[PDB]
From a paper:
NHLRC2 (NHL repeat containing protein 2) is an essential cytosolic protein of unknown function, mutation of which was recently identified in association with FINCA (fibrosis, neurodegeneration, cerebral angiomatosis) disease, a multi-organ condition which is fatal in early childhood. NHLRC2 contains three domains; an N-terminal thioredoxin-like (Trx-like) domain, followed by a six-bladed NHL repeat containing β-propeller domain and then a C-terminal β-stranded domain. The N-terminal Trx-like domain contains a CCINC motif at the position of the CXXC motif, which is characteristic of oxidoreductases and commonly involved in thiol-disulfide exchange. The six-bladed β-propeller domain comprises six NHL repeats, a structural motif originally identified in genes NCL-1, HT2A and LIN-41 and shown to often function as a protein-protein interaction module.
Residue numbers in the entry: 219 to 346, 352 to 572
The structure:
């Protein structure tokens, strides 16, 4: 109980300042820290709530996904079933989607606080300038979008700012890929990462209950298998810990993905296996990058001898030099140096 963090589920990196944003999930607060670990903002706490307003009165409820661009942070405020907006310039928290209770709507289409949502778990910025917030909607097994400005989703017509709706996923809890996004099926999708550039042009999805990684095309929304699971779209009992190509790889409840555009590699928080995996989206090869699989925590080690404990999220740093891991059940951000192949613990001060 001595770490300043408690079960931190997610971490992201600000691309223009190199700051980190940490969802300190168990303390119901969001941290903004400089890359050396010095805290700049602590927003929320100590108890769960859904209060908006100035920073000192704002509260969250077991938040997960965090995304930052241009001094605005969006929060998958999971247990409130809300998307929240932290405006660092104005030092105000606001609510931009959800009604504060768990929705069952598998389609969406309403604006903002008129639209019920269900256990949002991860968020990333996209571009139809950062005018889309993509949402891993774990509660209804779907990928959703919030329009931050008016714009068009892939193959759709323009929708007004604030529209919040399903993009991919039927709503059935399945491991189902499809040429048409509404006919695909996900199973507790919990991690997203954007690869907007050719030849990828996709969102990568950590599909936790199917133990797979999928791609969702930003050209036409086609949902495709990348690694893990089995062919049967109803089989959610297809987990394990196996390095291999495509369908031969086995994951266990992966909660996070992050795209490394420098190396054209995808890193995966393979949470229940206590490992970080690396996927080459070309060869579809999934191999172990770091983690022995045991949960005896060591604070300094090589990649191969490092340990994690259900890491809930991760994010590549600027220019792909460092990989930050929300090492959830160790209450730490682990810093993986991709040049020295060493793992350390981010100090928080």
């Amino acid at each position: 109980h001595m770490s300043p963090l408690l079960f931190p589920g997610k971490v992201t990196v600000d691309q223009v300042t190199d700051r980190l944003v940490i969802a300190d999930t168990g303390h119901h607060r969001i941290l903004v820290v400089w890359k050396n670990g010095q805290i700049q903002y602590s927003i929320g706490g100590p108890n769960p709530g859904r209060k908006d307003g100035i920073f000192s009165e704002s509260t969250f409820n077991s938040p997960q996904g965090v995304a930052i661009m241009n001094n605005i942070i969006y929060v998958a405020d999971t247990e409130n079933h809300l998307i929240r907006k932290i405006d660092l310039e104005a030092e105000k928290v606001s609510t931009v989607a959800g009604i504060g209770i768990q929705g069952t709507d598998k389609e969406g289409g309403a604006k903002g606080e008129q639209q019920p949502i269900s256990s949002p778990w991860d968020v990333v910025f996209g571009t139809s300038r950062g005018d889309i917030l993509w949402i891993a909607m774990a509660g209804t097994h779907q990928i959703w979008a919030l329009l931050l400005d008016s714009g068009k989703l892939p193959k759709k017509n323009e929708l007004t700012k604030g529209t919040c709706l399903r993009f991919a996923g039927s709503g059935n809890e399945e491991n189902r890929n499809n040429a048409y996004p509404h006919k695909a099926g996900f199973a507790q999708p919990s991690g997203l990462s954007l690869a907007s550039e050719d030849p990828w042009s996709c969102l990568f999805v950590a599909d936790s209950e199917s133990s797979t990684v999928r791609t969702v095309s930003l050209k036409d929304g086609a949902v495709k298998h990348l690694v893990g699971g089995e062919r049967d779209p109803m089989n959610l009992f297809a987990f394990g810990d196996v390095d291999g190509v495509g369908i031969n790889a086995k994951l266990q409840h992966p909660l996070g993905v992050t795209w490394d555009k420098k190396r054209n590699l995808l890193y995966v928080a393979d949470s229940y296996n206590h490992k970080i995996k690396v996927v080459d989206p070309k060869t579809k090869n999934c191999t172990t990058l770091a983690g022995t699989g045991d949960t005896n925590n060591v604070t300094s080690s090589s990649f191969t001898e490092s340990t994690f404990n259900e890491p809930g999220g991760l994010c590549i740093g600027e220019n792909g030099e460092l990989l930050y891991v929300a090492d959830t059940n160790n209450h730490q951000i682990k810093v993986m140096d991709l040049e020295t192949k060493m793992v350390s613990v981010l100090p928080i001060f």
